[PDB]
Design a protein around this nucleic acid. Structure first.
Lengths: 61, 272, 38, 136, 74
RNA sequence: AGCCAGGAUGUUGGCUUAGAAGCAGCCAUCAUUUAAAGAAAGCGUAAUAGCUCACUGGUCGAGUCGGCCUGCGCGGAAGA
RNA sequence: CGGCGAGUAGCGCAGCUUGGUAGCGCAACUGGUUUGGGACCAGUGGGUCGGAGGUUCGAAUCCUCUCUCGCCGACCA
C-alpha cells in the first residue's frame, strides 16, 4: 500500500506512479509515501510553501 | 498496465485519436472516428505490440431523485447495551427539489423548535448524509433532489454520540427514501445535426426511433440545424448508424443538458 | 404472401379476382395486400 | 368479471337447453345484438367481449348486457379417475336460448352502432345479428 | 396568378424583424434562408402596420425576384 | 362506366405555441365563386409541393345500381 | 392432487371439549436506583382471534366455503 499526502488527489487503480520509502507512523503497514506530481500523478495545488515536495511547480507570481 | 501506455504511444501519433478515462466507472475511452479508425487501433495493438483487448460499450451515471413526498418517517437509534451507547433520534422530512438552478442536488435545513438537537450534532448528523449521498440505494448510484426539513429529534446527555447521529440519520434516510418512492435519471444529451437536404426525413425519423423528440430545426445553404433531446444511452456509435443514411454527409454535436426520467423497461436494466 | 383464410380488400386499389375458383386479391399500390386462399 | 354474488348452491345439475328465447327483443335502448345460435356463453366471454366493444364507442353512448351468468360449471382436474365425487366449480356460464337480445346499446348512431357489435360478435361463439327497436 | 414555382403562403411576422425561428425553414425546404427573406419584404412592408399577424404569399420567382400577394390579418 | 375539363377562395382555419398547410390528433364540420368542389374518401409529406376521388358540365348511347331474405355450390381441409 | 391441525397484542405461547369475560412472559414505554449504562422494582398502552358468509339473543368460540403454513405418503407392476 501507500499514503497520498495531500489535500485531495485523483489517482485511482491505474497509471504507474513512482513510489518511494518512508513509514507514516500512523497506519500499520503503510510504510511508503506516494510520489506526488511525478510519473502518473498530478501533485497537489493550493500550496506554494515547501513546494519542492508535493510536486507543486513554481508559482508564476 | 502495458496496455494504456501502449495506446498513448499511438494516441499522440494520431492527433485525431484520444484516450479519456471513465471516471465514474473507472475505465477507458478509445476516441476514434469510425469503424476503420477503431479497427486498426485494435489490430495495431494486436500484432505490433502482441496485446489483446476486447472492444466494449461506454457507461453512464444513473443518478436518482424522488418523485413524491415523505411524511416524517423517523430514524432513532440506541446502541446502549452497556458502556458508552450510541443514541440519536432523527425524524425528518425529505422532499423532491427541482432539478433547477441551485448547484448541488440535495438541500438541508433545520426545523427543531426547542433546539432539542443541541448544536454540534446537526452538522455532525448531517455529514453522514453528506457522505451517504455519494451513492443512492435504489440502484447503487448517486442521487439528487433531497428537500430535507429536519422535523424533530431526541438524545441522551453523555451517551448520544456523533457516531450514532451519523448512523441514526442514515436509517431515517433509507426508510424516508422508500416512502418517497424515487426513480432513476439518465444523461439526456442536447444534440444537433446537420442534414444535406433530403435525408433529413430519415434523420428526424431516426431520432424518433431513439426516443428523441422534435425540438427545433432550421434550414441552411446545404444543411439543416436539427435539435433534439436524447439520452446518451441510445447514442452508442451514432455515426455508423448515422453515416449509412445520409451518404455520411451529416455533422453532429453532443452537449449535455440535464438528467431526466428513466422509463419502466429502462428502469430495470439496473439489474446486477 | 398473405394466405388469410378470409381475404378482403384492405384498400380501394385492391381488387377481387376469381382465378381457378381460388379467391385471390391483388393490389397494385401496396404489394402487402397481395393475398389468395379466400 | 361477472359472477353471482353469494348464491344458494355450489353446484347445479347439467340441464338441457331445448327451447326458444323469452327475453325477446329491444327493451331498453335503440339497437341490440340478437343471437341466432344456441350456446353456453361463459362469464369470461361476456366481459372480455364487452370491453372489446366499449373501445369503439370511445366514451359516448350507453352499453347494456341483457345477460348474467348465474350458472356454475363443474369440471374435474387432470388425471382424475371417473367418479370420486362431483367436480369443482371451475367457472360460470349463462345459457343462451336462440332469440335472446344480448347487448342493447343506445346513444351513438346506426353507423358506429353496426360496428361495436360487429367487433364484439367476433369474440362470441354464437352466430348473431342486428336488431332495432320497433313500435310495439 | 400562378402555381407552386418557388413561392410560399407563410409567416405573418412583419415588425419582429428577421422572422427566422418559426417559419424560416417552413419554406426553407427549397432554400428561402433567412437572409433574403425580409430585406426585400420589409422594403415593401413599409406601408402598413407592424406588430400584427400579416400573412404573406412569398412569391419568389424563378429568377429569385419577388413581389407579393400578401394579405392582412386573416 | 369509360373517354374529357374542372375540383378552386378566405384558410398556415385554431391549440398541444414540438412540425402538423384539407389529411397525427383532438374541436368546430363556416361561408364565398358557386355548374359544383368536403375547412376532405385515399396515396403522399421532415412539414409543404405532388397525384386522385368525392360532386359538377362535353361526347357517348343503352338499361343500370344498391342493400335484404332463401336454393344449390368454392375455399377453410395435412399422416403414416 | 386429500387430510389432520393448528393460525390468537411487535414475538413465542394459554383460553377452544360445554358459545356468554380476551390471558402467561418477554419486547417497545414510564419512573424509581447508580456519575452514567447493564440488571433489577412497581405501573401503562398495546389484538378484538387470518378472512368471507351463515346459524345464535349472543360467534375467539360450532360449522361450510376460500386462503396461509407446518408434518404425515403420493403405493403394488
Amino acid at each position: 500500500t501507500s499514503y497520498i499526502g495531500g489535500e485531495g488527489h485523483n489517482l485511482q487503480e491505474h497509471s504507474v506512479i513512482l513510489i518511494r520509502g518512508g513509514r507514516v507512523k500512523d497506519l500499520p503497514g503503510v510504510r511508503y509515501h506516494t510520489v506526488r506530481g511525478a510519473l502518473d500523478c498530478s501533485g497537489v495545488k493550493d500550496r506554494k510553501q515547501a513546494r519542492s515536495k508535493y510536486g507543486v511547480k513554481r508559482p508564476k507570481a | 498496465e502495458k496496455m494504456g501506455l501502449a495506446l498513448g504511444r499511438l494516441a499522440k501519433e494520431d492527433p485525431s485519436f484520444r484516450v479519456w478515462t471513465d471516471e465514474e466507472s473507472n475505465q477507458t475511452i478509445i476516441a476514434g472516428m469510425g469503424e476503420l479508425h477503431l479497427d486498426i487501433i485494435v489490430d495495431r495493438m494486436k500484432r505490433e505490440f502482441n496485446v489483446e483487448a476486447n472492444v466494449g460499450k461506454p457507461q453512464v451515471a444513473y443518478r436518482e431523485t424522488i418523485r413524491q413526498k415523505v411524511t416524517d418517517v423517523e430514524g432513532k437509534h440506541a446502541k446502549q447495551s452497556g458502556g458508552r451507547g450510541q443514541y440519536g433520534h432523527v425524524v425528518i422530512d425529505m422532499y423532491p427539489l427541482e432539478p433547477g438552478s441551485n448547484p448541488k442536488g440535495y438541500e438541508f435545513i433545520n426545523d427543531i423548535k426547542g433546539g432539542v438537537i443541541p448544536g454540534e450534532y446537526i452538522p455532525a448528523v448531517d455529514k453522514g448524509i453528506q457522505e451517504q449521498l455519494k451513492a443512492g440505494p435504489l440502484a447503487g448510484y448517486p442521487v439528487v433532489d433531497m428537500g430535507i426539513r429536519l422535523h424533530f429529534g431526541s438524545y441522551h446527555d453523555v451517551d448520544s454520540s456523533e457516531l450514532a447521529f451519523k448512523l441514526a440519520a442514515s436509517i431515517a434516510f433509507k426508510e424516508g427514501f422508500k416512502k418517497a418512492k424515487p426513480v432513476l435519471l439518465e444523461p439526456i444529451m442536447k444534440v444537433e445535426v446537420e442534414t444535406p437536404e433530403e435525408n433529413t426525413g430519415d434523420v428526424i425519423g431516426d431520432l424518433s426511433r431513439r426516443r428523441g423528440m422534435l425540438k427545433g430545426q432550421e434550414s441552411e445553404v446545404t444543411g439543416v440545424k436539427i435539435h433534439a433531446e436524447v439520452p446518451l444511452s441510445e447514442m452508442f456509435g451514432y455515426a455508423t448508424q448515422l453515416r449509412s443514411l445520409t451518404k455520411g454527409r451529416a455533422s453532429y454535436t453532443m452537449e449535455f443538458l440535464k438528467y431526466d426520467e428513466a422509463p419502466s423497461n429502462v428502469a430495470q436494466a439496473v439489474i446486477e | 404472401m398473405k394466405v388469410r383464410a378470409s381475404v378482403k380488400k384492405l384498400c380501394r386499389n385492391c381488387k377481387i379476382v376469381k382465378r381457378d375458383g381460388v379467391i385471390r386479391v391483388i393490389c397494385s399500390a401496396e404489394p402487402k395486400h397481395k393475398q389468395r386462399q379466400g | 368479471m361477472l359472477q353471482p354474488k353469494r348464491t344458494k348452491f355450489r353446484k347445479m345439475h347439467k340441464g338441457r337447453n331445448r327451447g326458444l328465447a323469452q327475453g325477446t327483443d329491444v327493451s331498453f335502448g335503440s339497437f341490440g345484438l340478437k343471437a341466432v345460435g344456441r350456446g353456453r356463453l361463459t362469464a369470461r366471454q361476456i366481459e372480455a367481449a364487452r370491453r372489446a366493444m366499449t373501445r369503439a364507442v370511445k366514451r359516448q353512448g350507453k352499453i347494456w348486457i341483457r345477460v348474467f351468468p348465474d350458472k356454475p360449471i363443474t369440471e374435474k382436474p387432470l388425471a382424475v379417475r371417473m367418479g370420486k365425487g362431483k367436480g369443482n366449480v371451475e367457472y360460470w356460464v349463462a345459457l343462451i336460448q336462440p332469440g335472446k337480445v344480448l347487448y342493447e346499446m343506445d346513444g351513438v348512431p346506426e353507423e358506429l352502432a353496426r360496428e361495436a357489435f360487429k367487433l364484439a360478435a367476433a369474440k362470441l361463439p354464437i352466430k348473431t345479428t342486428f336488431v332495432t327497436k320497433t313500435v310495439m | 396568378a400562378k402555381k407552386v414555382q418557388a413561392y410560399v403562403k407563410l409567416q405573418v411576422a412583419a415588425g419582429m424583424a428577421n422572422p427566422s425561428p418559426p417559419v424560416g425553414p417552413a419554406l426553407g425546404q427549397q432554400g428561402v434562408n433567412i437572409m433574403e427573406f425580409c430585406k426585400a419584404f420589409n422594403a415593401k412592408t413599409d406601408s402598413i402596420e407592424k406588430g400584427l399577424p400579416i400573412p404573406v404569399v412569398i412569391t419568389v420567382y424563378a429568377d429569385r425576384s419577388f413581389t407579393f400577394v400578401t394579405k392582412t390579418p386573416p
